[PDB]
């Protein structure tokens, strides 16, 4: 199976450099194009360019000439996108996508890597339980005061997916994000099943686990 797994989220200062990786597996790496597509919060997708693993050659859209390069590690079937001299307008999600040149299309995409350009230091979140009280009970984690986006939240190490809502992050007057993740569950399992939310905020290396009890 074709897989495109990209490197994790980044925070960078204006004027710095970011290299993003997209590790390819499940096919002869050198026989398909590697394309990069930029997506800004709320925006249409933009084709940045591609590199041809077979020739080593890169090609860029007009808007992406200059500060942008593409690299290859053929042996490690990994492609890279480097952006120099970062500006706020580069704050975005970036996707690698495989080019099936036989019909000129992007048949498989990476999960995207989000890159925030900011002058501000990172700030890990505080995580507080939202506790159930009193056949269906709600319970959650409050993921408070962090920068930048995103955080990853999962419950019970990912083994619980059903009935879970992780909300969009919202900004407070403080300049920082907060969100809540909730789950609904049979109120009968409150006294058997133990529920842990796992919160991960990579740009600050915060990995928390929080028991949510009555």
């Amino acid at each position: 199976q074709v897989q495109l797994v990209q490197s994790g989220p980044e925070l960078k200062k204006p004027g710095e450099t970011v290299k993003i990786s997209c590790k390819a597996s499940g096919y002869m790496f050198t026989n398909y194009g590697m394309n990069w597509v930029k997506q800004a919060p709320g925006k249409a997708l933009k084709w940045m360019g591609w590199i041809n693993p077979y020739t080593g050659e890169s090609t860029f859209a007009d808007d992406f000439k200059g500060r942008f390069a593409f690299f290859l590690e053929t042996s490690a079937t990994t492609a890279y996108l480097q952006i120099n001299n970062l500006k706020n307008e580069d704050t975005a999600t970036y996707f690698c996508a495989r080019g099936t040149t036989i019909v000129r299309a992007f048949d498989y995409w990476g999960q995207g890597t989000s890159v925030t350009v900011s002058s501000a230091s990172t700030k890990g979140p505080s995580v507080f339980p939202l506790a159930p009280s009193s056949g269906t009970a709600a319970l959650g984690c409050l993921v408070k005061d962090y920068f930048p986006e995103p955080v990853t939240v999962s419950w019970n190490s990912g083994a619980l997916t059903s009935g879970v809502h992780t909300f969009p992050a919202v900004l407070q007057s403080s300049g920082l994000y907060s969100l809540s993740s909730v789950v609904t569950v049979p109120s009968s399992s409150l006294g058997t099943q133990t529920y842990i939310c796992n919160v991960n905020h990579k740009p600050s290396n915060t990995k928390v686990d929080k028991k949510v009890e009555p």
């Binding site: 249409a44 997708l45 933009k46 084709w47 360019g49 090609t59 859209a61 007009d62 996707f95 996508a97 019909v103 000129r104 299309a105 992007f106 048949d107 498989y108 995409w109 990476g110 999960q111 995207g112 505080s126 507080f128 339980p129 939202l130 506790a131 009280s133 269906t136 709600a138 959650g140 409050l142 408070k144 809502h165 909300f167 969009p168 992050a169 919202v170 407070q172 907060s178 969100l179 809540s180 909730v182 609904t184």
Partner: protein, 218 residues
Amino acid sequence: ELVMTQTPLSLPVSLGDQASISCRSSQSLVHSNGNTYLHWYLQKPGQSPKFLIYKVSNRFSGVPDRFSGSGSGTDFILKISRVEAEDLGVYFCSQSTHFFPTFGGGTKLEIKRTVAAPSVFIFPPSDEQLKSGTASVVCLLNNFYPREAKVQWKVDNALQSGNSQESVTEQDSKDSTYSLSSTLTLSKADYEKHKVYACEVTHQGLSSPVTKSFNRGE
């Protein structure tokens, strides 16, 4: 350069009905070699695009037969006959007949379904947060339709303004409902000035506003 224009920007559609998304290039997409390189992708919320239709009318592997592409030259349509809840997302056309490849602005496909009342849950701030010096009170409206909802906070029965935030999920890909959180954020000090904490919900599903409350230290 090649403008591609999608219409509409948002397409509301009922389960089981037909959705039509139109896409239109500034110039013809027929290559000198015989082929029309117009493609369709779909992006569900938080997710990377998924390849949908290639060369105007060919489904990609694993793509349901209810999706259907057509048109020629400058104008193209994607039809989703008999729509399903999991068809929700933003649809993009993309041309790659001319350098450089472009994408249209996308069309967000929204499902319409019957009104559905929220379940309301309230959450006191925790001790751990109280001892960190702030108090967040969280009000949850779960699984409702439609989206618009009025959530008022009352504190000792006084109406609050401009000290809370709302967040709303995307439409659920199984039952097409929404969920929302209202959060009242106060300093631990303001918090302990009052006993009663209540959120009152008004929504198309409910015949009378629903109120969910608690007094502090419970």
